[PDB]
RNA sequence: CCCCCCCCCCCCCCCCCCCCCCCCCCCCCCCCCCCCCCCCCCCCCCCCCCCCCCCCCCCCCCCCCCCCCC
């Protein structure tokens, strides 16, 4: 029977990947700091600092960002990820000290805390500006209030989530989605960006993106911070705000199998193209391999998974002409930015997309009615 | 076949969410006050205090009642609560004590309590204030009642029937359900308005709005207050009014389920249009959703539940559109200041739904009868 | 009733013209002429309500 | 039922008319020459006297052929074809003589007709043009043959091919068609226009477009005569032409009926619009209206029959638009001067047409397969 | 009002048939017994009962139709 004469590559490429009995661990290289519940109240005085401070140097803010999100999540819990990641990590005790120095002549207590990857000079220096930001603002308005200080228990998440905005348009590739980030926060947040000096959007995504770059499991790190932080009974509207802003990115560098679903709910003709036609046995097959990973593969791109190659639909050039073509006939398209491999049939499912809104909906009383 | 080119992302996201395995522990900052049993009379004794009190200040009524809430759950259960909701607590031990001093020129003995963060001056003060209303409106009526004193064992669970109000209109983000809170309590709670001299609805729905944007878990802990209340065997009058408000609240943030279960019983026909229908999937979907949460649900935007926007239906502009419309047509939608995204077919929907009085149904004896 | 539906739904479809005949059911006619004009917005309306 | 609010307008339009009891009878004017069997030689002789002449003169050329075309049907059934259309006819005897007159200074012997409609002189001059070209042509070659010389039997038949020719472009309303005519009459008719010197096809064809426009009956009498002459057991090859070239006229000012079965057949989706599907009941009313006419249909818009306004679609205009469209993309509508009144059903179909060629055909296994 | 475009057709190859073959052939008359049929008893019917009985005229309002475009 001719019927027969199949192959489920998808699923077998799955099924070899999922059954291995062999595994990689790989070397960080650097030592991790895993900070503890014990100085969260200590970053995120950090973090307000960094925010009531304006024209801000941001250069340090990712990692700041990171050690808050770590020490959120325990020094337990980041350890047993960096582990689950498959990852050699040099765990590395962080605790508060105070150091003792002379600035202006006059002796000063400061409160610092001994990360290997942060010196003292550059906490120093963040509260020496935040101080003095602080003192020629009260000068200007008199009295503060609880909302311009470094003291609100949601300064560090704040910062979180302009790295919850880096983190959905993280898998463009490159800093290619920073000005969606920048308009995105301009957005959101814009109260805050009245409350606070130095939210400069920019600077701090740009230090997210590098640090990132430069830590690909620090992308691991905050991707299940977020998760655990999502998975919470209830929190501020800070972190309501986070929540929104983190599940944006769910199903990031996946857009074509949304793209796809919704193809089929307008109905378009051109799926019932010949050479579609030929490709639907494994495009369901991608389709069913999406469903049964479920939940967890939403963050495949973002975490650069090796099965996200899986799930991609370009590998079948009509059905995804068809895609893009019925999408950009829709006004959804926006300036994504992959091109059709099948031009004739991404024009003609664009155009019956364009008439799908002049001209309702085509019946199909041709044959027999 | 096309028919299995579908994702189910709603249910995806749910189950990436509640199948974490690694949590966060948030750190309250300030010490929480965990009063037992033991302090509930004493507590309850200081809201009556406050409620004989005319022309009060109650600019401290919200955390008396939130210590009033968390001595009826217990400082076992307060404690439970506040680890389940993943926060990192210093539980302060409150207990009853003496303090003397000469006021008038004359030694006073007071009972007060030993929290950090309500001053012993505070309950002095409101004392003071009691006894001396009391002692003038004894003056101009010459007797008392059970009625007009602080002895009452309600006065507590009244001012959280303001709180309970409050609760119900939190989920607007911010204080704009202030007015509605102040009529329902006038509405409601009128013989006490008479009652007690200091039970002024505005002051005290400020308070709580205050003590509720300050603290977040205090959010947390009213609610389950709350619940553990409405699931006694019976009580007072005032219980079952508290109760009575606080279910209220429940679905607080989620109109439009209802409003789209509504427009499905009205048989509304702008349900058959061809983008509603193609949104009718999803739409489907998240009210299977709804109904697999269940109870849990009905809370989660009062307590920023992450996965309050896995409810939203505001992702289907069209159906959202149609539901909204109907509404209005209806005549129930009042004030609501959600806005249609697609303005015809919102129109569409108010008129149909507005020609569903006077022009009572429509049959469909089009099409074969 | 019918005649006010026919010329609500004539008037809807932006065919009436100066015809100077009137309706007797002003409600009706209304109704008819509304559902009319977006019968060319809103393309059709299927009928799933009920079963589908 | 809402099934039978219904109304038959073409069935009722068509009994109408077919169910008259009272006639009227048109006036000519002008005497009808009615010519028998027996002058059939020498009109045939008039007419090969007409195709030998050089550089001539087709003044009277339709009127000759028209004449031809009456002999071939004889006296009776010419007079009977006249009272059939409803005309009342003074039937002019047309019979043979010979004139004597003196030209160059010799006495001629002519034989003419006694044509009410056409002059002695006229075919004395005929007579004579044509003597003096075939006295240069036969010095210019030598020797003639029965090629070249007025005897040929199919003289007047070319002549009438000319003439069915014309009646194929006469439902255009004007002589817009006269380029049509002059490239169909080089297309066919080549060997003739070799051998013919006179067989000049637009100046015969002006002569019939004069003739069809001063004469309405004389349309009749043609088409009836093609009728007659396309129902013989045979005949020569020029006769073969001229009723291959009649039978092109079958049809003409009907093409959209053809054209929308021609759009039934490719399966243009923009069949099944809503408005479409409206008209459809009225279209079928049409196309059934057009079968129970059957074969007398076919000249309705040549005849100007008064029920040829019955076949017309472009009372629809949306099912008249996807037709144009159609057409149109399948590149065969030419230089058809109807325009679409639904300039965007015709873009659609236009494009979906365009589309049946490069993507071949569209399955529907969208709904269940 | 309606209509409006393009378009002659044809074109090749090809007689068919061809063999063998008379059919039949035997045996066989059919029938054969026994047997008339019927047979009893029995007229049928039988009573009671005329039918009907009331009430009730009917009706009553409003209303020309049409109107466009082609």
Not at 109 to 128: C, D, H, M, P, Y
Not at 157 to 181: E, F, N, P, Q, Y
Not at 341 to 362: M, S
Request: net charge neutral; charged share 20%; aromatic share 8%.
């Amino acid at each position: 029977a001719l019927s027969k004469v199949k192959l489920n590559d998808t699923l077998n490429k799955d099924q070899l990947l999922s059954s291995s009995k062999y595994t990689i661990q790989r070397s960080t290289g650097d030592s991790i700091d895993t900070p503890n519940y014990d100085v969260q109240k200590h970053i995120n005085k950090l973090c307000g600092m960094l925010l009531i401070t304006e024209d801000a140097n941001h250069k340090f803010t990712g990692l700041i960002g990171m050690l808050y999100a770590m020490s959120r999540l325990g020094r337990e819990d980041t350890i047993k990820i960096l582990r689950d990641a498959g990852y050699h990590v040099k765990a590395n005790g962080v605790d508060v000290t105070t150091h003792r120095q002379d600035i202006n002549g006059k002796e000063m207590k400061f409160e610092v805390l001994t990360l290997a990857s942060l010196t003292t000079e550059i906490q120093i220096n963040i509260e020496i500006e935040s101080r003095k930001s602080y003192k020629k603002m009260l000068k200007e308005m008199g009295e503060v209030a609880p909302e311009y200080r470094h003291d609100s228990p949601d300064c560090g998440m704040i910062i979180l989530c302009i790295a919850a905005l880096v983190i959905t348009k993280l898998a463009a590739g490159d800093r290619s989605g920073l000005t969606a980030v920048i308009r995105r926060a301009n957005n959101v947040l814009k109260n805050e960006m009245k409350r606070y000096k130095g939210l400069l959007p920019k600077d701090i995504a740009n230090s997210f993106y590098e640090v990132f770059e430069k830590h690909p499991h620090f992308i691991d790190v905050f991707v299940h911070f977020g998760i655990a932080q999502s998975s919470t009974r209830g929190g501020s509207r800070v972190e309501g705000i986070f929540a929104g802003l983190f599940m944006n990115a769910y199903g990031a560098g996946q857009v074509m199998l949304r793209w796809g679903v919704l193809a089929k709910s307008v109905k378009n003709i051109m799926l019932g193209h010949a050479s579609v036609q030929a490709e639907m046995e494994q495009v369901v097959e991608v389709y069913e391999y999406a469903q049964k990973l479920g939940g967890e593969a939403g963050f495949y791109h973002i975490l650069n998974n090796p099965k996200a190659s899986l799930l991609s639909l370009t590998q079948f050039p009509h059905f995804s002409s068809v895609v893009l073509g019925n999408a950009a006939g829709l006004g959804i398209m926006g300036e994504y930015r992959g091109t059709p491999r099948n031009q004739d049939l991404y024009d003609a499912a664009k155009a019956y997309a364009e008439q799908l809104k002049e001209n309702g909906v085509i019946n199909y009383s041709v044959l027999d009615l």
